[model samples]
Target chain A: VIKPDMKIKLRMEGAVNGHPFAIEGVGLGKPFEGKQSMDLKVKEGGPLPFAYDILTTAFNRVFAKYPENIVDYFKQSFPEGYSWERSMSYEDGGICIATNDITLDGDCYIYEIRFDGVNFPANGPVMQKRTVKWEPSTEKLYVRDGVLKGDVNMALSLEGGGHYRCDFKTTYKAKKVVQLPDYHFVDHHIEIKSHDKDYSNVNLHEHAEAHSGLP
Target chain B: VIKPDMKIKLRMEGAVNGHPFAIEGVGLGKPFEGKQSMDLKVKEGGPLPFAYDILTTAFNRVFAKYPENIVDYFKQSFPEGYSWERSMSYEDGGICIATNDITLDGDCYIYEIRFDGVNFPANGPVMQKRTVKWEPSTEKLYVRDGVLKGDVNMALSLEGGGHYRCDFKTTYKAKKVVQLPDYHFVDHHIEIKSHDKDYSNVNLHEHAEAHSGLPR
Candidate 1:
């Protein structure tokens, strides 16, 4: 639960294929008193509600649910809608994962995950295919000193009917460390300026291939 | 591993937003000898290699590796490009799970998973947003009677600044009980034609919400 008085700051970084992706920002959950809109704060260049709408939703299907005030936050944050210029620095990165459920036979499944545009609003959607199989593997949880962790491993079964599978893992932690950067919510709106250099020169394709060596 | 002589039969049925979705078919994995292309089989409306090209590539990144002759399966199957009419029944549904990896700081991560189109080529990219939080939760594996089952639960912190979190579960079963319906590899072409009814009425939006009640 996010309390009105709680301060929130987080930074998430990782790779897709091989390109390094990062999301660093700060925001307060909604507040109890005062204007609910004024109390909410999100770092510029971070994942916004609108990003989810296009990248995830299939027209009307919305698998990702949001708080009631989400629309209001956007209304206040970018009363001007969204602009590509005032967002995602050349250094920022984003990721989106899509999947198809499994077979009744439990033999196969399909998936696609993308990491691109260092900034949530910049660049295009990058994607890669993957598959899951019904087999004995690791998907465990751990606790130490009141902290939670996860070690996940699964096999990949590609599109064509092939059994040549790959193994992968995901390790997760249980604490949210706060780190807020100095910025002006100028005019009650967050302003994120793009990087001075041309992001096009960055070889995103090469980054995608590098992700194959992911941990 | 799928063997050359192994016969594969399976039936997958589920619901999307109150509508019924099911797939029944059979195929053999690539055989060892002969034309690698001729050795593969897949049901009509099922996921083929071509679908992955657009749906799963990383911009220019295409990493989910497949068997060598997988391409042959599609060439022999479609011969032409993909057409909606020759695939999944109107009742079929798709699911995609997108996640945010969380470490103490929550910055960079890796992700690639899709649950869309029971018949891979049937529909447009339909999506649902999901989250994975950095907190205490359950993601465990179990063993029973020589079968593996997974019970999972996690929280989601969506884009923007809100903790309007939700919990979801994914269950996995270890065995593929052969249930391939009787169909001839007639002329080495597995035939799958659309059901006679028009599938245009099943509003896909409704199917998206129905997924929230996914099995826990």
Candidate 2:
């Protein structure tokens, strides 16, 4: 390990993907180091600012007709399109994963769409081996909710009153900054896990018999 | 109750909501004594043509952020809105409905989402007391499928790889033309029932008693 600098001049500031941020200034007149530390105010908004549009569209478009028929729609465009029958494996809730074309082969984006008691509409609220053809653009079938929306040129001749459609959204948040062993900055990224954090800042301390004039 | 017309003059043509349709012409040079009836070719498309835009927009907007949570989302905007807990009654795979604001008191448009084996993604796919605030517009918390949409500025820091979101949509088709008893034309509407149709056309047959005809 190299010796710590005696007189340090901290300079750090960065802006990513339009997320403006800054970290400036230091404890002036404060020599070496002791009980004095400057707090690095982390200022940013998203992973959401951009994510908002992406999700709105996904939920609004591709997965639009789902809430009407959960199991079937889930079978259709659940996510990344996997075989769901290709030598599958998993944990928790238990949704199908590997497909003829899964998103990632590894555990990078691994997750599930655990659905329970999905009542499209029985009496008031609203699938099978659902084929991709079920798309409104393809099958030309607008479920209940689609009809009530008022844009469609048809009537909602149902046997009774119930829900038009139903369903939800989910994502992980990044937090709890942790220091790396070697204190590297090359990756410029992080990971998600329990009771753990990725590398952020390295805290250094110093102690020596002779005063080193390093800066 | 009345003598049918000996010489039927079939003159019928009409349109509704830009839905062009017509039923004209008669079996010329042929007397109406025997079996010689003009085939009234019924042609029209929809409650769809308009329903198409409605559905696409619905599936794409207001009820947009569902697919992420079936039970919860369904609970939020499940048709017309009503009090599920009030004088509760129904049939089939159940769902919690009704609010302080219910739709119609009686059944009109009735159906079900009837979800089976919904795997939002246990290992990959991805609630509890669902409030209307669960709306993405209010919560400010986008889920997995939402995160990957690329609109949000945050990076998906998930523990592992999995499906972004999952769900479905439902609507009813108005078909099966049934004849009303009174043969009335007051309401340009229809209802849905098992093996039943709404008033559309009424066919007439000749009887030896006298000449008769129905210009439905």
Candidate 3:
């Protein structure tokens, strides 16, 4: 019993790398199955507000594969600030697989992973260290522009001792991939450097508010 | 085709008394495990001051922790110099990071000093003390030189948390006075000839094959 049809009909038909594409639009569904090339659309009946404005205009013209205007390129970059942070290191086999989070999954280019790394604990007292997180070993990642490189595969079991081998490797540098809706923002802040430290994969960014898991 | 690393470690097995439980202690990391015992350390003063009169009779016949006579050990430990700690001092191999300070370490032949701030504290920064007197410098070492280049005209000095008031002063010039100048030595720092026989035969063969091991 699929109701709500004041006028609806749309078709997509996919195939990218191998070619073949077809997209005829209108809005709303429930009549699929070779039905008179259904392109009628609506006005006052339920098709989820016209299929959410035709899927937010076909996700900004074919799934936002961003090449420019990434939200006016970050509101001309941090025009004022709502959220934007970095740091997500990874180098495992001895230690160093922390997470400063890697959000931005709203409009969806994708990524929300989470993991943390704590220190000093070879045996008791220093208040018995070792917080060691991240056991993802790959759980999905993709957010190129605001940056979110990936690779995960942890089996680490550290607390007051070690057994070792967790291949964590994040790159993170998202200042905003898409959450800038409630903003008013720039990019004048300096000291945005990276590359200095010889052994000991360095990464530090804090905002759990360290780390994510939403994409 | 070598695989005996059942990973997850810390052993003392006997196959027999394998009842109770195993332990871990926390050092972070976990997987691809096997073999890392033998820790034994303590070698960061360049085989010591790098070393020679055969490391002052092999550090007075092996590491003389001082039978006194390392005499006139004047003392200005770090008089604006000498800090050395990095030898990875801690972790990388493990342990040693609790400090009460005092551990610059360097050796081979003798002792060295340079004092000139008699740790004074009676009305410091005696500013407005209305006074000045110069001419008292004689720090020219040569006998086993642990070097001491001196000079002083010092007065109410500065640097501290402060009490808004207190007095100040510094005195030092040291060399190799044996347990008799009360010290004497020979050094030029070139593996002071085989850094005192490679730090006294690998610390008496790592303190007799460490944790004491013998069979014959």
Best by TM-score: 1
- What is the docking quality class of candidate 1? incorrect
All candidates: DockQ: 0.03, 0.02, 0.01
Compute the interface RMSD for each candidate structure.
18.9, 17.2, 23.8
Top candidate, metric lDDT: 1
The interface RMSD for candidate 2 is 17.2
Judged by DockQ cut-offs, the docking class of candidate 2 is: incorrect
lDDT of 3 by residue, A140-161 (tens): 2344433433343434335555
Model 1 lDDT per residue over B54-173, tens place: 121111001111234222221121112111100111111222222121111121111222122221111222212222122233323333322222233322333453332222222122
* Candidate lDDT (C-alpha), each: 0.21, 0.18, 0.20
Number of clashing pairs per prediction, in order: 46, 108, 46
lDDT by residue for model 3 (B43-133), tens: 2222221111111111111111112333323222322222111000111111111001112123211212100011111232321221111
Question: Model 3: how far is A54 from its true place, Å?
Answer: 46
- C-alpha lDDT of candidate 3 relative to the true structure: 0.20
Model 3, native contacts kept: 0.00
Candidate 2 lDDT, B26-116, residue by residue in tens: 2211111222232222233322221111011010011112232122222233334322111011111111111111222232212211111
